[model samples]
Target: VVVLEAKNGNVTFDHKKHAGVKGECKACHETEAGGKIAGMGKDWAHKTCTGCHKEMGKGPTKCGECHK
Candidate 1:
């Protein structure tokens, strides 16, 4: 996960890898824009890495995990 702070901030979330575990995209990415996560910018993360961490009960608590 890569996180950029300050202006034009950006966060990279790996999603494809974890989706296989749950065997479903609709689990989180099933919603359209303005959904529970899309509104929170979790769609991308939901598809890749962040979602797993969340599913695993880890919410990016570590500084290096999501921060530079």
Candidate 2:
């Protein structure tokens, strides 16, 4: 479980669910052992995670849904 402190709401990331997609570490985490996200992170999250959710038709698509 990875916890990111957010002003609206903290995001709890679960590797298990993502890894279920199979061999996706490099897809998200550039570092082998895993590291932080790109950009300042917030914007990156909106573009990456939020966009992916839209593409996959899963998760939150609205800002308020994710933020709080």
Candidate 3:
């Protein structure tokens, strides 16, 4: 589990679940083990996370949705 701290709220990232579903750390991580995102935090999440959520019809797309 990885906790991503933010002003809105810290997001508790379920690495296991994400890895199992999304597959490959490279998708989000820079290395095999997982680390920082490209832009990091809000910028990336606003683009990738929210964009993906809007397209996939699953996952959080609102500020309060994940920021809790």
Candidate 4:
């Protein structure tokens, strides 16, 4: 996981902290066994995270959650 920051018309990201919570690796990456979302994947931010967040109605949604 990474946190994108803007500075001097440039963007920076903090991977450490974000990874602590957002970077579980498997949360997004899965290995294929048979078929259909069974392989290593990436997009938990939307596929996994959003669903939970939406259900719980917690955290900031819209864009900052993954974009910023």
Which candidate leads the pack in lDDT?
3
1-68: candidate 1 lDDT, tens digit per residue: 32333233354555544345554655555543313454344445445556567667855745355644
Model 2 off-target regions past 4 Å? Answer: 38-40
Residue 35 of candidate 3: its Cα lDDT? 60
Which runs in model 1 stand beyond 4 Å of their true positions?
1-9, 31-37, 41-61
Predicted structure 1: lDDT: 0.49
- Quote model 1's TM-score: 0.37
Taken over the whole model, the C-alpha lDDT of each candidate is 0.49, 0.72, 0.74, 0.43
lDDT of 4 by residue, 1-68 (tens): 23233332222333343353433554344532222344312343456656655765664456544453
What RMSD value applies to candidate 2? 2.3
- Which residue pairs collide in model 3, if any? none
lDDT of 1 at 2: 25
Regions more than 4 Å wrong, model 3: 20-23, 31-33
lDDT of 3 by residue, 1-68 (tens): 77789987898777665654454677676778766665876778888777867877877877888888
**C-alpha lDDT (0 to 100) for residue 8 of candidate 1:** 33
Candidate 3 has a TM-score of 0.72
Q: In model 2, how large is the Cα lDDT of residue 53? A: 81
Q: lDDT by residue for model 2 over 1-68, one digit each (tens)?
A: 77767978878777776764424676577765767765537877877788778877877788677665
TM-score of each: 0.37, 0.73, 0.72, 0.35
